[PDB]
Amino acid sequence: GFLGFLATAGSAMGAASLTLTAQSRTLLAGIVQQQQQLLDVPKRQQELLRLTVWGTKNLQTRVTAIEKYLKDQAQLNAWGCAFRQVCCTTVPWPNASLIPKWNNETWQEWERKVDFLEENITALLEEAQIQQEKNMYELQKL
Amino acid sequence: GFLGFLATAGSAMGAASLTLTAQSRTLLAGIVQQQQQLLDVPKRQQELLRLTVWGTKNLQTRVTAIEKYLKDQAQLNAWGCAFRQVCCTTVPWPNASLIPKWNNETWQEWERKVDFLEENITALLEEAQIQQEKNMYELQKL
Amino acid sequence: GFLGFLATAGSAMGAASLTLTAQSRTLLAGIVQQQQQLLDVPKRQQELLRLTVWGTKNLQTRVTAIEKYLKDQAQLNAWGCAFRQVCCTTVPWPNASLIPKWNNETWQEWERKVDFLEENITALLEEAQIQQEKNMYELQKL
Amino acid sequence: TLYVTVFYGVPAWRNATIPLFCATKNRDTWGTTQCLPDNGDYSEMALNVTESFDAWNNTVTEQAIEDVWQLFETSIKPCVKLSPLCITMRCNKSETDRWGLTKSITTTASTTSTTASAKVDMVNETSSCIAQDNCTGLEQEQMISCKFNMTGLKRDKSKEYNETWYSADLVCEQGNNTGNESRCYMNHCNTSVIQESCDKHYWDAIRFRYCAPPGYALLRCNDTNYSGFMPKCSKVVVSSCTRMMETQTSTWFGFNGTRAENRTYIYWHGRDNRTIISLNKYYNLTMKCRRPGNKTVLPVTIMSGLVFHSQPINDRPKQAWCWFGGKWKDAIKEVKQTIVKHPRYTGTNNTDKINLTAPGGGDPEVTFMWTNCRGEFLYCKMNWFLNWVEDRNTANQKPKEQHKRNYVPCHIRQIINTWHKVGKNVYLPPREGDLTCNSTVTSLIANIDWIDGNQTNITMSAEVAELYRLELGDYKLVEITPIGLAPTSCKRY
Amino acid sequence: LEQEQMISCKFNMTGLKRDKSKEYNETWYSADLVCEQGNNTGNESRCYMNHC
Ligand SMILES: *[C@@H]1O[C@H](CO)[C@@H](O[C@@H]2O[C@H](CO)[C@@H](O[C@@H]3O[C@H](CO[C@H]4O[C@H](CO[C@H]5O[C@H](CO)[C@@H](O)[C@H](O)[C@@H]5O)[C@@H](O)[C@H](O[C@H]5O[C@H](CO)[C@@H](O)[C@H](O)[C@@H]5O[C@H]5O[C@H](CO)[C@@H](O)[C@H](O)[C@@H]5O)[C@@H]4O)[C@@H](O)[C@H](O[C@H]4O[C@H](CO)[C@@H](O)[C@H](O)[C@@H]4O)[C@@H]3O)[C@H](O)[C@H]2NC(C)=O)[C@H](O)[C@H]1NC(C)=O
Ligand SMILES: *[C@@H]1O[C@H](CO)[C@@H](O[C@@H]2O[C@H](CO)[C@@H](O[C@@H]3O[C@H](CO[C@H]4O[C@H](CO)[C@@H](O)[C@H](O)[C@@H]4O)[C@@H](O)[C@H](O[C@H]4O[C@H](CO)[C@@H](O)[C@H](O)[C@@H]4O[C@H]4O[C@H](CO)[C@@H](O)[C@H](O)[C@@H]4O)[C@@H]3O)[C@H](O)[C@H]2NC(C)=O)[C@H](O)[C@H]1NC(C)=O
Ligand SMILES: *[C@@H]1O[C@H](CO)[C@@H](O[C@@H]2O[C@H](CO)[C@@H](O[C@@H]3O[C@H](CO[C@H]4O[C@H](CO)[C@@H](O)[C@H](O)[C@@H]4O)[C@@H](O)[C@H](O[C@H]4O[C@H](CO)[C@@H](O)[C@H](O)[C@@H]4O)[C@@H]3O)[C@H](O)[C@H]2NC(C)=O)[C@H](O)[C@H]1NC(C)=O
Ligand SMILES: *[C@@H]1O[C@H](CO[C@@H]2O[C@@H](C)[C@@H](O)[C@@H](O)[C@@H]2O)[C@@H](O[C@@H]2O[C@H](CO)[C@@H](O)[C@H](O)[C@H]2NC(C)=O)[C@H](O)[C@H]1NC(C)=O
Ligand SMILES: *[C@@H]1O[C@H](CO[C@@H]2O[C@@H](C)[C@@H](O)[C@@H](O)[C@@H]2O)[C@@H](O[C@@H]2O[C@H](CO)[C@@H](O)[C@H](O)[C@H]2NC(C)=O)[C@H](O)[C@H]1NC(C)=O
Ligand SMILES: *[C@@H]1O[C@H](CO[C@@H]2O[C@@H](C)[C@@H](O)[C@@H](O)[C@@H]2O)[C@@H](O[C@@H]2O[C@H](CO)[C@@H](O)[C@H](O)[C@H]2NC(C)=O)[C@H](O)[C@H]1NC(C)=O
Ligand SMILES: *[C@@H]1O[C@H](CO)[C@@H](O[C@@H]2O[C@H](CO)[C@@H](O)[C@H](O)[C@H]2NC(C)=O)[C@H](O)[C@H]1NC(C)=O
Ligand SMILES: *[C@@H]1O[C@H](CO)[C@@H](O[C@@H]2O[C@H](CO)[C@@H](O)[C@H](O)[C@H]2NC(C)=O)[C@H](O)[C@H]1NC(C)=O
Ligand SMILES: *[C@@H]1O[C@H](CO)[C@@H](O)[C@H](O)[C@H]1NC(C)=O
Ligand SMILES: *[C@@H]1O[C@H](CO)[C@@H](O)[C@H](O)[C@H]1NC(C)=O
Ligand SMILES: *[C@@H]1O[C@H](CO)[C@@H](O)[C@H](O)[C@H]1NC(C)=O
Ligand SMILES: *[C@@H]1O[C@H](CO)[C@@H](O)[C@H](O)[C@H]1NC(C)=O
Ligand SMILES: *[C@@H]1O[C@H](CO)[C@@H](O)[C@H](O)[C@H]1NC(C)=O
Ligand SMILES: *[C@@H]1O[C@H](CO)[C@@H](O)[C@H](O)[C@H]1NC(C)=O
Ligand SMILES: *[C@@H]1O[C@H](CO)[C@@H](O)[C@H](O)[C@H]1NC(C)=O
Ligand SMILES: *[C@@H]1O[C@H](CO)[C@@H](O)[C@H](O)[C@H]1NC(C)=O
Ligand SMILES: *[C@@H]1O[C@H](CO)[C@@H](O)[C@H](O)[C@H]1NC(C)=O
Ligand SMILES: *[C@@H]1O[C@H](CO)[C@@H](O)[C@H](O)[C@H]1NC(C)=O
Ligand SMILES: *[C@@H]1O[C@H](CO)[C@@H](O)[C@H](O)[C@H]1NC(C)=O
Ligand SMILES: *[C@@H]1O[C@H](CO)[C@@H](O)[C@H](O)[C@H]1NC(C)=O
Ligand SMILES: *[C@@H]1O[C@H](CO)[C@@H](O)[C@H](O)[C@H]1NC(C)=O
Ligand SMILES: *[C@@H]1O[C@H](CO)[C@@H](O)[C@H](O)[C@H]1NC(C)=O
Ligand SMILES: *[C@@H]1O[C@H](CO)[C@@H](O)[C@H](O)[C@H]1NC(C)=O
Ligand SMILES: *[C@@H]1O[C@H](CO)[C@@H](O)[C@H](O)[C@H]1NC(C)=O
Ligand SMILES: *[C@@H]1O[C@H](CO)[C@@H](O)[C@H](O)[C@H]1NC(C)=O
């Protein structure tokens, strides 16, 4: 589609350049080409669109494109900062033993050093957003 | 997945505690487990993924998870207040004959008393948002 | 579903009246009726839900409803102005040779005069949003 | 002043009627193809809510019934059809006459014997009569050695084969056979085509549980007063997945149930007199069935290349039979007492006027107990058992049925009319070797039917599908719909 | 108006019992038969279905 995400790999975390439109673009390129094929197959074979294996493998790939897009949006909305880049959430970093070398390490190298933190962090980020929402709920009610 | 929505049932409407991340969490737990199974079935049976009944029943359940998530987001965006908790819309309540006992009644008991209002209210909430949007359209144009 | 979009056709671009809730409403009307049928077919025929052609044609139409909704939301988020009506983006119009008669021409007549501009504009609109996001990224980081 | 506003994230729900996911532990064949792995999370939360539960009109139970049936159908669909075998077979005449499939008037039998012959015979684990398959009153299995001409993949060549049928599986042409070699056909071929149930179905246990899709949940009634129909259950428990279900099929008694508790429960249909009686696990009720002998199995390739499994036993083994252990007398007394005290019962309070009984009629589908032992279906005649467990005064039940025993004679049937409402006949391949099954008894499937304050008849039933309504039943499937409306003063700008 | 044109024909058909068969009475519309021609100096013509 473009693969501009991978294009900056090796540039280090600082000044890596983050792009928020990148998932929309990979999905959009995908949907258009797959839709054209959905309408093209019936020109010769309309009956066996899902009966045989190719139509169930292609269904899983079309479903994955949609489910993947939505998982990112759902996780971001759970955190609430879907369009905030750095998001600036209130959950503290777990420990001082895992601090990135912002000017030496690449995001690819860094993320693999925090895989065991993400499991606890995702929940904490959601909890922080939930309490902020509870506080606003009460302000709107009263 | 968690079922934290149902967990507070019986607590009364006031102080019920509303959570906005709850649908994202039910969807996310679902998508991950179903994706793992989509990749696991082909290990033994790749051809008959949708031909036989189990693959069409499971398709309806995967489709429902996505359609349900999107119906909530689409209805909320039609109203416009997707991330506003109480939303604070401008449509007046239909009559004084149906006022909740915020400190005695539960949301489960209350909603069943307004099922015949929701049919008219949904449309009114959308209309109110539409006029607000029309007013901003003109301000942006002029 | 309502078709309020087409309902104002022929009114001219100025005062055409734009509605942002309109795609949510077409999708919502669709999902509810199709879900009712998904649950109704198994009453008599649960096994052949996707094996035969009708279930793959209906799958393509249900998939289209979802993919179409998401393409609009994905393109809008790439531009970033999903709920801003006129959006007020920073990309300049390509040339003075193509200026609408806001009080004479209809959106249907106008859009067909800019089909060859949209191909270049979509990318420019995304680029403008990307740089704005880069600027905020740096402000949040520093 | 008061605006509708929108409350998102609301703790509320409505009735759902959607398909559920299955999840299992046995993934050797069926499980991998159709199910998710069992997560192992069986925890639940209690809610301070009141809800309406019903077992005979649910979505959870009605999927269990249809799903078990449907997974059966997709398993047999590709197996060898036996229409090529619906030919005249040449059967030994003596054995056809002895078992009564054909007639003879040259046997002119006459018997003189003692009529005051009723006996009481008890067996237990520590007995040679079980090990040797020779308990008082057991006879020979009833098998007709038959020959037939079958063609394989070579087309222009054929062979004669040795097949021994259970009498239950043959029709046999009658009239003017003054010699030998009677002419027999399979019992259910001519009105239909018999298909072999080749993919090991019923040779192992099928267990699975259901899970709600995202946005949905299962509520369960966790009362002790739940009797199948309960309009207001005060103990409502919420979870995402059901308990593990045993998809076992039988008549009269249910075996290996998950709802095995130290209590007797009786579920009644709200609009009917049909019930499922669980049995109290306190009494360790168990049924141990045996298939004496050592079977040989011979694969035969038929024309299309698919294989049929023949049974060339060429021997005369004893009848298949079942032994009932555990404290049956006391478990049954509790059933009678539980019925007397039940909210829906307005019959007799005299437990000596409440009796277990077979359904009437001459139809084997209801009068015999039908049970599955690793792939072979057995049909048991239970008069000896019922007379024993009830300590019945037999007296006038014809010499053979006037015994009190804790075991019953049974027979094997290979051509089976399946349990769902289909009318489909399948052939069950024989198991090689000897068979033994040791199952627990967890339920009694019966109707309770009384018309007065004397005689209540707990009538054993053949409605195997209702067994699924004891395994599940207490579940309700609901949709979480977390958007609410409510008047409040807090209007935007 | 004339008569419908129908040829009463007999044939031997085998059912589910395989080694047994019966003769059946079938009346065809002429439009549906082919019929072999030449040197039938008796009766019982030899016909097949029109499109088989
Ligand atoms: C979520 O899921 C749950 C779980 O399934 C749902 O809960 C169930 O909801 C059903 C309705 O949707 C309820 O059934 C209905 O009950 C009505 C009331 O029944 C009683 O009163 C009857 C007569 O009373 C009249 O007069 C009084 C005042 O004097 C009025 O107030 C009444 O309204 C009436 O006008 C009486 O006959 C009933 O007793 C008989 O039926 C009950 C059935 O529950 C039996 O248990 C009794 O033993 C008795 O049985 C006789 O009749 C049956 C035939 O049904 C025969 O088989 C028996 O042999 C015997 O002769 C009660 O005392 C009923 O009026 C109503 O029936 C009408 O409507 C249905 C269609 O809905 C038609 O098919 C009928 O033919 C008839 O016209 C119906 O039975 C369930 O009780 C309830 N279950 C539980 C556990 O609570 C829930 O709704 C779902 N929610 C959502 C949102 O989906
Ligand atoms: C009510 O509940 C009870 C309790 O759960 C249940 O009884 C049990 O049923 C299960 C399932 O049928 C039985 O488990 C099987 O037992 C056989 C026999 O094992 C004994 O005898 C052998 C003799 O060789 C001894 O070696 C052995 O130690 C035991 O004493 C096993 O053979 C079965 O395993 C097969 O499948 C495995 C899959 O992983 C293979 O790895 C293994 O090699 C076996 O393969 C054989 O079968 C295959 C069929 O697919 C075939 O293809 C192969 O070629 C080969 O033939 C399995 O362990 C268990 O023993 C029963 N226990 C008791 C006490 O009865 C009741 O059935 C249930 N009743 C109802 C009505 O629901
Ligand atoms: C798992 O499941 C088992 C089986 O149901 C339970 O075992 C039963 O437990 C109950 C409660 O303790 C027992 O009931 C009591 O039996 C006593 C003994 O009575 C014997 O003699 C009389 C004749 O006089 C016989 O009818 C009877 O069957 C016995 O042979 C009684 O003395 C007790 O009486 C009490 O209640 C009555 C009201 O009914 C009062 O009037 C009395 O004054 C007194 O308070 C009582 O009836 C029952 O016998 C046990 N059954 C068996 C087979 O052992 C387990 O308890 C259960 N496990 C758990 C953990 O709950
Ligand atoms: C298995 O049964 C034996 C014999 O008991 C008799 O026969 C049974 C089939 C049944 O009809 C019983 O009611 C009969 O009493 C048991 O052996 C006896 O055990 C009792 C103690 O409970 C002892 O007093 C007797 O002397 C024993 N009899 C003999 C001949 O030794 C045996 O214990 C039972 N097995 C099990 C596992 O319970
Ligand atoms: C399928 O076969 C059954 C039984 O076969 C007949 O009766 C046996 C005892 C034996 O003599 C066979 O050779 C016979 O072919 C048929 O059931 C009988 O149907 C007739 C009516 O035509 C009726 O008078 C008999 O009482 C029935 N007998 C029994 C035992 O049910 C059945 O009709 C056959 N089905 C088809 C489609 O041919
Ligand atoms: C299918 O059959 C037709 C017709 O059958 C032949 O002609 C009938 C009048 C009768 O005499 C039948 O017994 C005959 O078998 C075949 O059509 C004929 O084909 C030949 C060429 O081989 C041609 O010369 C004739 O004119 C055709 N006659 C007609 C009426 O069309 C046809 O070829 C057969 N198809 C196949 C695959 O065998
Ligand atoms: C079911 O129970 C029977 C006992 O009633 C088991 O059979 C015994 O097995 C042991 C070990 O091989 C032998 O020493 C005994 O002699 C056997 N008893 C009899 C009466 O034959 C049987 O193995 C159990 N389960 C299965 C599946 O076979
Ligand atoms: C279950 O069976 C009992 C026994 O026949 C039924 O009880 C009768 O109900 C009618 C009213 O419909 C009364 O007039 C009779 O007097 C009752 N008979 C007795 C012996 O009490 C009962 O209605 C049946 N249950 C259902 C749901 O149909
Ligand atoms: C990648 O390698 C090229 C040389 O092939 C070098 O010029 C460039 O600066 C490198 N970029 C990064 C981020 O290391
Ligand atoms: C603390 O740092 C170590 C790395 O030295 C890491 O393995 C561990 O998981 C960290 N603990 C927490 C709570 O983050
Ligand atoms: C990068 O490595 C150098 C040593 O070569 C070190 O002095 C510097 O502090 C490191 N950068 C960061 C961000 O830690
Ligand atoms: C629910 O019931 C428990 C007692 O079992 C009680 O302590 C708790 O306060 C109740 N909660 C609500 C919301 O009623
Ligand atoms: C007025 O209140 C009654 C309840 O008493 C309700 O049934 C009715 O629908 C309400 N009318 C409107 C317009 O909300
Ligand atoms: C709750 O009920 C009491 C009476 O028991 C009543 O005085 C009170 O006003 C009710 N609460 C609300 C919110 O209406
Ligand atoms: C459409 O035509 C009708 C006459 O049939 C006219 O009254 C109306 O003003 C026209 N609307 C537009 C937008 O041209
Ligand atoms: C300039 O205007 C002409 C119409 O006269 C149009 O065809 C052309 O594509 C426009 N060029 C650009 C860069 O928009
Ligand atoms: C509409 O057409 C008239 C001529 O009939 C012209 O004077 C006017 O400027 C046009 N409107 C626009 C917006 O160009
Ligand atoms: C269900 O009831 C049992 C008592 O029979 C109790 O121990 C258990 O905790 C209850 N379940 C829940 C979720 O409360
Ligand atoms: C089951 O209950 C539903 C209401 O939820 C009702 O419409 C249906 O008729 C009932 N089915 C039976 C068994 O009558
Ligand atoms: C059947 O078995 C006997 C041995 O009892 C053997 O002599 C005979 O040849 C066998 N017949 C066929 C057809 O296999
Ligand atoms: C047996 O033979 C007699 C003639 O001796 C004949 O009347 C009778 O119908 C025959 N029965 C059968 C079943 O063929
Ligand atoms: C029994 O079968 C044999 C052939 O194996 C035949 O010769 C003999 O005559 C038959 N018996 C009778 C009574 O017909
Ligand atoms: C055909 O019908 C005649 C009566 O017109 C009847 O005598 C004859 O037996 C029937 N033939 C067949 C094969 O059914
Ligand atoms: C009819 O018989 C004659 C001989 O008499 C032969 O020449 C001719 O070919 C035959 N016709 C047919 C159609 O068989
Ligand atoms: C007509 O058919 C009969 C047999 O039913 C036969 O005997 C007769 O000879 C045939 N007619 C001619 C002319 O061959």
Side-chain angles (χ1 to χ4, degrees), chain A residues 68-80 82-84 87 89 122-123 125-133, chain B residues 19-28 69-70 72-74 76-77 82-85, chain C residues 69-70 73 77 83, chain D residues 8:
Chain A
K68 180 170 168 59
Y69 179 79
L70 292 173
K71 287 193 297 192
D72 288 344
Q73 292 294 304
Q75 188 65 67
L76 288 170
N77 287 335
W79 293 337
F83 300 101
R84 292 175 60 82
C87 300
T89 61
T122 298
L125 291 169
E126 292 175 357
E127 289 176 355
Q129 183 62 26
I130 292 166
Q131 185 63 48
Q132 182 176 309
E133 290 170 352
Chain B
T19 301
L20 274 53
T21 65
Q23 289 294 62
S24 294
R25 287 182 290 172
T26 199
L27 181 63
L28 289 165
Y69 179 79
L70 292 173
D72 288 344
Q73 292 294 304
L76 288 170
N77 287 335
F83 300 101
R84 292 175 60 82
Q85 287 78 310
Chain C
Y69 179 79
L70 292 173
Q73 292 294 304
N77 287 335
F83 300 101
Chain D
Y8 187 85

Side-chain angles (χ1 to χ4, degrees), chain D residues 147-148 159-162 314:
Chain D
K147 295 178 180 175
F148 64 90
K159 296 184 180 180
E160 190 182 33
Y161 292 89
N162 274 343
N314 297 306

Side-chain angles (χ1 to χ4, degrees), chain B residues 93-98 113 116-117 120-121:
Chain B
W93 186 253
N95 62 3
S97 295
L98 297 168
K113 294 184 178 184
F116 53 84
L117 300 180
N120 298 62
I121 292 170

Side-chain angles (χ1 to χ4, degrees), chain D residues 445-464:
Chain D
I445 303 169
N447 300 346
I448 301 170
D449 189 356
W450 71 100
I451 62 170
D452 205 335
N454 41 16
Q455 298 300 320
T456 294
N457 293 20
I458 301 168
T459 301
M460 302 298 288
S461 173
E463 184 64 14
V464 68

Side-chain angles (χ1 to χ4, degrees), chain C residues 23-43:
Chain C
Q23 289 294 62
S24 294
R25 287 182 290 172
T26 199
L27 181 63
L28 289 165
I31 291 170
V32 172
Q33 291 181 47
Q34 297 307 318
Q35 288 175 343
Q36 290 169 343
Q37 191 59 41
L38 289 173
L39 298 176
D40 191 72
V41 173
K43 290 176 181 172

Side-chain angles (χ1 to χ4, degrees), chain C residues 60-80 82-126:
Chain C
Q60 290 188 356
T61 57
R62 276 77 176 266
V63 171
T64 297
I66 298 301
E67 289 182 355
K68 180 170 168 59
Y69 179 79
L70 292 173
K71 287 193 297 192
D72 288 344
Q73 292 294 304
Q75 188 65 67
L76 288 170
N77 287 335
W79 293 337
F83 300 101
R84 292 175 60 82
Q85 287 78 310
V86 175
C87 300
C88 301
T89 61
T90 63
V91 175
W93 186 253
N95 62 3
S97 295
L98 297 168
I99 304 298
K101 296 179 181 177
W102 277 103
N103 295 325
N104 297 10
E105 290 173 336
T106 300
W107 278 108
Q108 182 62 30
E109 293 169 323
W110 172 251
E111 287 298 320
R112 299 285 78 78
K113 294 184 178 184
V114 296
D115 282 337
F116 53 84
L117 300 180
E118 183 173 2
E119 183 175 357
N120 298 62
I121 292 170
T122 298
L124 292 170
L125 291 169
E126 292 175 357

